[PDB]
Amino acid sequence: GSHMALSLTADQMVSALLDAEPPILYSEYEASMMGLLTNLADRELVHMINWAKRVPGFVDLTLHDQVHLLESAWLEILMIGLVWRSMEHPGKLLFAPNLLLDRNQGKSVEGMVEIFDMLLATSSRFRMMNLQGEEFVCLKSIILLNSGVYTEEKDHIHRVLDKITDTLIHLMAKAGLTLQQQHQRLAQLLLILSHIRHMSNKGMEHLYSMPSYDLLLEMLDAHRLHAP
């Protein structure tokens, strides 16, 4: 059977997202650091396509719409994944369990330190808020559906986004927060998403100064040929 996105209960949504989670990858072991970080990003992207196809409502969109969303969100998704992993490592970014880099290691590449500092600050914010795994998967799905939303069909994305918000609220209510604390926590998290967008924009600026629609269209389509 197949659950349509808008029929999922909060528990079914959490179960589907937890099941969709990509694995934690290892680094293949200043030019060497950039090479290792690009290779890791390339490998995470293959898993990100598999994950996006399992995000409720994503497959309901046309292939062209799926590509637009992934093209706009891929760096924000890699970054939220990085900051989540790095939570328990103050002052460091856990790119991989065998690639834990300090702030000073980022200074070896020009313009990279400002991005590393913003990522560290986001990781510190999630740590202080005690972000839960179930909340993290909801936020990452929201980035996917929201980042390219304003760039019937549009109503469907917004209704799926409402379902994910209901899921975040349900998690917070079960965790013991009052209705007021639920709204404050949801707002805090969504405001952090605007900083994640900021980081991706600064990241993309750096990339273009030295992962296209075409590459993503081919990878999203090639997924149909993978074994079940």
Asked if residue 193 binds a copy of itself (CB under 8 A), the reply is yes
- DSSP per-residue letters across the chain: ----GGG--HHHHHHHHHHHPPPPPPP---HHHHHHHHHHHHHHHHHHHHHHHTSTTGGGS-HHHHHHHHHHHHHHHHHHHHHHHHTTSTTEEEEETTEEEEHHHHTTSTTHHHHHHHHHHHHHHHHHTT--HHHHHHHHHHHHHHTTTT--HHHHHHHHHHHHHHHHHHHHHHTT--HHHHHHHHHHHHHHHHHHHHHHHHHHHHHHT---HHHHHHHHHHGGGS--
Among 37, 48, 87, 137, binds ligand LVH (CB under 6 A): 37
User: Which of a copy of itself, ligand LVH, none interacts with 99 (beta carbon under 5 to 8 A by kind)?
Assistant: none
Distance in Å, CB of 78 to ligand LVH, minimum = 4
Asked if residue 13 binds ligand LVH (CB under 6 A), the reply is no
Q: Is 43 annotated as a binding residue?
A: no
Task: Give the per-residue contact string, 65-104, with a copy of itself (x = CB under 8 A; - = no).
Answer: ----------------------------------------
Among 3, 50, 201, 218, binds a copy of itself (CB under 8 A): 201
User: Which of ligand LVH, a copy of itself, none interacts with 37 (beta carbon under 5 to 8 A by kind)?
Assistant: ligand LVH
Asked if residue 82 binds ligand LVH (CB under 6 A), the reply is yes
Q: Which residues on neighbouring strands pair with residue 93, listed in sequence order?
A: 101
Among 64, 174, 198, 226, binds a copy of itself (CB under 8 A): 198
| C-beta nearest to ligand LVH: residue | 203
The footprint of a copy of itself on residues 3-42 (CB under 8 A) is none
Task: Give the per-residue contact string, 122-161, with a copy of itself (x = CB under 8 A; - = no).
Answer: x--x----------------x---xx-xxx------x--x
What does the block give as tokens for 214? Answer: 């075409």
Tell me the C-alpha distance between 113 and 60, whole Å: 39
Among 41, 100, 173, 177, binds ligand LVH (CB under 6 A): 41
